[PDB]
Amino acid sequence: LDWTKIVSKLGLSGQTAAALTSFKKRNDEAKRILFELKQQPSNVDFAFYKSTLKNTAIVDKIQSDVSKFTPSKANLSKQLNLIESFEAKALENAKETESVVLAELTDLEKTLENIESXXXXXXXXXXXXXXXXXXXXXXXXXXXX
Amino acid sequence: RYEAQVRQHEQEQLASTVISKVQSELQNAKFQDKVLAQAVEEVERLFAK
Incomplete structure (x- = not known):
């Protein structure tokens, strides 16, 4: 589930510090909003509101419409921007690293x-293998700089 | 809160008008109230003796 491995998952470049801090702040605030709010629908105390209202059939009509359905600020999974980018990142960063590690x-x-x-x-x-090992040291320094 | 205030105001206004009518009837020389007071005192003393 990794603060220990999530912050050190990037490379030597410090450009990923702004992207990692924005994803960690949005994930912590999303879990606190669902835990602080009630996980129930609505009370709608219509037993003491219909007999205490001044106008006749006032609290009974508002309780039936609020318990049915309404609109919310939700969206669907059609705008999958990060889903298409996750599969393309594995072919250029994860699949390319397999041949370099081999x-x-x-x-x-x-x-x-x-x-x-x-x-x-x-x-x-052994002299032929020493030439490839010497060139590997220069390639490792060029990949880090 | 509005239904409870309207019910409390109507009960307070009805109790004030009933208290004024009971005080105005006793000052008009009520013959039935004077005869009932003497008979109630004699019946209470006989039950305790």
Whole structure:
């Protein structure tokens, strides 16, 4: 359910601090509005209002219309702006990171075994892996800057 | 609140008019009220003795 992992889910850039603060403030205020308000419809005390009204058939007609149906400021799920953006973000940020993590793990596993293995039989092969490991260090610095 | 105030004002006005009519009837020399007071005192003293 993560304040511990939700605030550190972004990258090294500080541009996501404004978007993460707006989503956390709207989510906390939405839960407090539903808990402070009553989860019932309406009381409509018509047992003591019909006999105490001055005009005849005044409180009885207003109680039948208020207990039926009325209008509210609601909307439907037709304007799914964030639903279409969530699927497109997974193909450019989540799916693209899978190929980068697979190439980084395969290059690091081959460089660890070549650095510990001799100097004529398994050397020329270790020199080729050392060139890819040296280029990986420059690519990692270019991806962070 | 308006129905309770209208009911309390009508009951207070009816009680004030009934109190003025009872005081005006006793000052007109009521013969039935004077004879009933003497008979009520003799019946109460005989029941306690």
